């Protein structure tokens, strides 16, 4: 025991479907004895825009704004914003990063986007050395847990959509095993909207049953065979 | 040959490359004689968030918030917020949109990830049915025009970040293809902060010598295939 770990959350409503994924996580993961944190990034009215905000006093160079070398020198003079540390102090903490949230336009919703754009700067999640295997945040786990308007069969390889791994990867490789997370298998309910009330019970128990068990997974190899190939 | 564009256009500072590209754009299409209008997202404060700020009337739910089915409904009875319907005008008016910006995490940086979310709502992107080759923005053009901290070379199925087509695949298929676009192959400049000065003048011209032809040009076969190989 003694694992840590933090949700973030992107739904704008508590009865939703997300809403009872991230409940049902809280509570499995709780009654286990793990230590638990939530950002609920719309009730938090999560800023998405990066911008010269983000960094507290003098800029590196106030003439001509470079996003990622100010923000890459602001980590290491501890300058950011206190909403950017708040959530580096979150994630430095936990063990497993869940990501719960509704597919917007095969990726995450512009709330979530703008977390990853503006909480994963570099010195905090990836550097020059450290990325892929060996970024910064390295021994942590991350779990993408999505649900969609799609059934599975459109998420297929020659469905409409495409295979559901196709988009995962800006997501899975991209941005999380760049950071260095190891990735666990995404969590994906399939179209709840759909579903029968019997159908969505079974989704949210498949991810209690399989929080039961999340400790003992193996990382899935985050390659761009697991995505695109048979 | 009275062509409307909308550019689309997310970078904070105007003396970027991805300024550069913008202007170079406007520059050229407005010598040929085009209607052009930009979008610039951080100058406009463009709010990214899905939330029921973005409906006025009275709520189809108003007890369980959902942004789909609310958004709908709006859209038929004119209650959407009127910054979405600002955007909206200038994409029905445009024949090509042109959307500018760097790659934030294999992604489009959260501004414009909301402007996605928020403008292409259903009822004026796309219906059910009436999406991907039935999607209601058919007719219409769009390219992706999109700088990288990466090289080329990384940017190869061999590569550590995949080809580049990958990350297209959400973007292009998911989002502009869904919505009835047909989509021109996408302008990647490549490491634009690696390239010396005259690397940079040469990708700047090379974007503003193909807008001199984009008129003749056809559009990707936006599929699987295209985008992944055999
Ligand atoms: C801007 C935008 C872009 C989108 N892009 C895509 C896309 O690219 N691809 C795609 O496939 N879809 C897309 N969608 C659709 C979207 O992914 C789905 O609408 C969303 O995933 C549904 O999840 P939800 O939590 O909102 O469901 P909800 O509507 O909140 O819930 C579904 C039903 O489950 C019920 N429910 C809630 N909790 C429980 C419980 N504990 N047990 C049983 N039933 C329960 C709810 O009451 C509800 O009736 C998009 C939607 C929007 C708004
Ligand atoms: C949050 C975040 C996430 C990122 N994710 C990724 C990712 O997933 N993958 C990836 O590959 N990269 C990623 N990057 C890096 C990013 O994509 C690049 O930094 C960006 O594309 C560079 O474009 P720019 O316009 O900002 O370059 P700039 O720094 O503005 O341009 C480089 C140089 O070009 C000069 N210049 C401007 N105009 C001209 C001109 N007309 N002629 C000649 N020179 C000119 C500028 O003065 C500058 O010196 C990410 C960056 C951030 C901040
Ligand atoms: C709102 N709703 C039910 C919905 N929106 C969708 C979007 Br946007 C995309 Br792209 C796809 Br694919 C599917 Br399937 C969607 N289903
Ligand atoms: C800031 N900078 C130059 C930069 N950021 C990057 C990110 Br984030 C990713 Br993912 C990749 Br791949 C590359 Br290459 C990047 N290069
Ligand atoms: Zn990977
Ligand atoms: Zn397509």
Redesign the interface.
Same mark, same amino acid.
């Given at each position: 025991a003694g694992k840590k770990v933090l949700i973030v959350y992107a739904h704008?409503?508590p009865?939703?479907f997300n809403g009872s994924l991230k409940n049902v996580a809280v509570d499995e993961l709780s009654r286990q004895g793990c230590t638990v944190t939530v950002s609920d990034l719309?009730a938090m009215?999560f800023e998405?825009?990066?911008?010269?905000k983000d960094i507290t006093g003098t800029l590196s160079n106030p003439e001509?704004?470079?996003?990622?070398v100010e923000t890459h020198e602001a980590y290491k003079q501890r300058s950011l914003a206190s909403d950017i540390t708040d959530e580096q102090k979150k994630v430095r903490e936990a063990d497993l990063v869940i990501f719960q949230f509704p597919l917007?336009?095969?990726?995450?919703?512009?709330?979530l986007?703008?977390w990853?754009?503006?909480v $994963?700067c570099q010195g905090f999640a990836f550097d020059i050395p450290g990325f =892929?295997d060996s970024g910064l945040l390295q021994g942590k786990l991350a779990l993408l847990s999505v649900t969609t308007?799609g059934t599975a069969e459109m998420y297929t390889?020659?469905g409409?959509?495409?295979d559901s791994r =196709?988009?995962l990867?800006? $997501?899975q490789?991209?941005?999380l095993h760049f950071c260095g997370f190891k990735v666990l298998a995404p969590q994906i309910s399939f179209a709840p909207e759909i579903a029968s009330e019997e159908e969505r019970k079974g989704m949210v128990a498949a991810w209690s049953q399989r929080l039961q068990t999340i400790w003992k997974e193996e990382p899935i190899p985050c390659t761009?065979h697991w995505?695109?190939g048979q």
């Open positions: 704008q409503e009865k939703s719309y009215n998405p825009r990066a911008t010269d001509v704004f470079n996003y990622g917007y336009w095969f990726s995450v919703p512009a709330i986007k703008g990853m754009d503006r $994963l =892929y308007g390889k020659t409409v959509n495409g =196709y988009f990867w800006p $997501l490789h991209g941005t761009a995505h695109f």
